[model samples]
Target chain A: TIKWIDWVKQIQSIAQAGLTYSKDVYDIERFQQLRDISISMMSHYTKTDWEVVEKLFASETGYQTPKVDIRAVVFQNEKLLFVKEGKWALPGGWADVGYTPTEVAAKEVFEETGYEVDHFKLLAIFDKEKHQPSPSATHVYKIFIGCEIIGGEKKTEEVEFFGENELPNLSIARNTEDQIKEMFAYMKDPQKEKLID
Target chain B: TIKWIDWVKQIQSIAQAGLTYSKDVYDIERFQQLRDISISMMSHYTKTDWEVVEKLFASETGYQTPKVDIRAVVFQNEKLLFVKEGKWALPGGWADVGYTPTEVAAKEVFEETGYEVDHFKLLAIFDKEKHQPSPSATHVYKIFIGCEIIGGEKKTSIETEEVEFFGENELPNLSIARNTEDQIKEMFAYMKDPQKEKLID
Candidate 1:
């Protein structure tokens, strides 16, 4: 019945950790230690199925591999445009360190659909469930935003469309119809909910 | 009924972000563009009660900003050791990055309590609802582990009181019970469940 136990657990553990480790005179050296101990304990005690943990650990390399895994959506006018020019999408991708996200969004749109954009703004954040990835894989969250088709003509073909005229247009860049719609709405109205992720 | 509405919103937006960014090809430039735009929108939306976003943006200025935090329990047989060290905690501080959690855990326990223990296994990971700084805050999580003493003095006056060890029976003064007894009980439940119940991180 408590399908959301993970959420509850996540909230509590983080709050506790923040309280403990972030004291005014906090110790990172020891904070890492306590954090590690608690994490291992959680894996041991809270873990119901050892198999999943084993699988993850088995794949564990030398370091704690972390993937921020991000994505985006592009909207032109009130309608959502799927940039099917060669690669799909109007241009979107994950953020990189040392680079500003707005420039990154603009660059992606230009590269994918060959168009400049304006009024670029983040839409919202999401969980893995909302993204619908394959089974057994979590860590999914997307940032939807709205932008204009400052340039670039529509592609000669359609996305995910197949035929002699259209190349089986797989998403050259990451994108989805749901995400497209997300950006579309924000383009229509931006002052509503936070465009956070 | 749905206190997690904000959390859900974050997760959902990130899911969309992943779909729009990563899942396709690794485009560093494009990723950055989306990131800025996304952050701007977040500023517009979250409307966090306090200007927590301000602190996070400037957190990099802090001396120990890029370190990981840890929490552990020293359960001697059934007795757990709780610390009542300082205005804060032991001398051990933030993570140095790139160290196995086990190695770091052992180091913290020894540095704070002067007790050398073998970390047998792990326990839990959690974050706070409202981060420190009161006015503007975020979430923070800690990891707890169960360990065994290997080589250490019977008692010594370190950051913690020496010679006394309590347990699952009842928590004493509990000056710094970051890795609490309730969490231990959860671990106990996991032990009994033995790979049967639904476990989450």
Candidate 2:
């Protein structure tokens, strides 16, 4: 469905890599032009403003690689915890630059759910493109972390726990129902091997 | 030891994030200037050319995040495989944009060591800053994947000068910038214990 988007991304990567490594002035200018073309294609296809697309995607430099997003899976009373922001989602966000993935998961869980989590076990690492239906403009790797809540009050009303088969409308951009179920399976079987894809 | 490098990186990230989200024109200009200051500091500290540092670091945009590097661990006949390039290192590189981490590991193993690896098990995911003594300008996450060689003849390439296997105690001079002796030893331990949980940091 988003082949053109993928092509645009490929072109942008080629351009960025060329800009980073190319020493010839002519080659550098050519790569810059290629990057601009990619920006135009992305803007046209997404129906977004050219400037907006440029700021979001075109200005990116360096060797292109996937960005990391963490999702903290916490369970209590045989139910999963979720935070609502228009739609239900796991309590986590982008992996910050300075913090490790585990640290990011715990910090995000505490900040979003007001439930302090100390221990963490990596449950899975998934390529978002392979698992998620929607294609993202940026390539991303989703890290699922099983978090053990230590202490903290649920400060927000939006935060709640749900049993299996009673999941609320999920923020699919952040996580899918399949992933949530996988988390439950991991919770049910403590010895389940960490999944990678 | 390299606190200034970390500060420069922090500044670069702030500038990148500010540029990505800020709507105010003045704020954008301020962020752009901040980015320039970071580039200047990086160049000064490393004794690299201003243009080189600017091209390498300043042109980066969007919210900054760590890059991923994959290293393939293959053991045969009680010896670990390594490819030499001045110093011996595991066969792998930066994760390509299109390929999954596992796929990248297999591909890198084939390209660098001339060994076809089909089966892969992730052994560890490490924050390079925490494990390595040398600080890098860019933040990176290193993934160690245990790979099973399927079939292929060993060959050398431009990136690799030799391909050989060594016993744990008889390990060659390592490419510490890529993999350390301590990490290689840990990989051996994981190989011995199949049920061992993956190490993450």
Candidate 3:
């Protein structure tokens, strides 16, 4: 019996480390075989074609680094904006390439809710595990940002602004009730130093 | 005629996006072929074995998210500490999984220069692109952490040949590739005010 996810993760790690450091022909071949096995295991579990799944895996190189996730915290009339994704969550997702953390905050806000935001500032950088259970297969570092809405109307599939003690059901995969409250705390005192965990 | 690196990147992005959002067999197969072409292009450019290069690219999944790179700023006596990596660099590397930002600062301090550090505090999180042209192929956000060494002996492996605490005026070459003189200036700035707002973007 095996926790196949962890088992595959271990093999993947070994294969990655081997390719990073080894150049010997036999060593490379051994590592390649390990990698192929891990890819097969991953594809089997996810039910995706190996060729497609392999490219998804091939998109990274060097050290397996933690992915960055960004959440834009925008307040209106002292109420926090939460969008309905089955249940309410922050307007954010995985930070994309070619964008800074500030850029990501502005971009995600506009993309998810169609509201352009400005005066972007870092509020906190939380280790995904430090705050809640991960909603991703890969490890991630979450960056919570504060922003002021400049313009644009609600374009989200659905969204709501929650006031103090007026919280609604949360998606939990993204933001939780407590996390939203942290945004309120930051709003109360923007001068406070950014929180890290 | 095109840049293979950017071309492969686009292909990889398209293939990943397709896999994530599309379940159609024909669509997936097309994207998969594009990915194979990307792999071939990458191998041709890098001259590394296709299988090895593929694994490097394959290690990442889903969206191509920015990875956090951490550097530990340790000062000895008032001078900053830098480990020799041909030229020199602040003690750090790509932030590994399963560790908090604080934990990474400590772990990197121990690994790179053989010193255990405490009271670790984040000084800045500058987008690599916003600061300097990246020496890496992938996108990155660099985290600068302020730490104080508590214990541990010199334990750098073959990775580092020498470690030294250097005065501000004397910095080796090549360190400028990934790190810049501005970062050193920030270290001095941090000593003046540890409670300043974290630098982002």
Best by lDDT: 2
Over 4 Å off in model 3, which ranges? A1-61, A134-137, B1-4, B44-49, B134-136, B153-161, B167-174
lDDT of 1 by residue, B93-185 (tens): 333343344555678778777789774454443222212211111222334445678898544666655445664455554333243344545
DockQ of 1: 0.02
The DockQ value obtained for model 2 is 0.13
For every model shown, what is its TM-score relative to the native structure?
A: 0.35, 0.78, 0.76
In the range B17-106, model 2's lDDT, one tens digit per residue, is 657765656545655765666676566556666687777676755567788889999999889999888799999988888788888999
Estimate, for each residue in B1-201, the C-alpha lDDT of model 3 and write its tens digit: 222244345445544554554444544454455455556655555556678767776445666687788888888777888887668888888888888888888988887888998986767788887778632346789888888888997664564557878777776663765588887778877776766666778
lDDT of all predictions: 0.41, 0.76, 0.71
Candidates arranged by DockQ, highest first: 3, 2, 1
In model 2, how large is the Cα lDDT of residue B161?
Answer: 50
Task: Looking at model 1 chain B, report the run of 10 residues with the lowest lDDT sum.
Answer: B58-67
The all-Cα superposition gives candidate 3 an RMSD in Å to the true structure of: 12.7
Fnat per candidate: 0.00, 0.26, 0.44
For model 1, the superposed segments whose C-alpha errors exceed 4 Å read: A1-197, B1-69, B85-96, B126-136, B158-164, B173-177, B187-201
What would the per-residue lDDT of candidate 1 be over residues A71-168, giving only the tens digit for each residue? 43554323354545465654455443222345556666665556677665444543334454555432333434445557664433543322222323
Query: To one decimal, what is the Cα RMSD in angstroms of model 1 from the true structure?
Result: 22.2
Model 1 residue B111 lDDT? 70
Give the higher-DockQ candidate: 2 or 3.
3
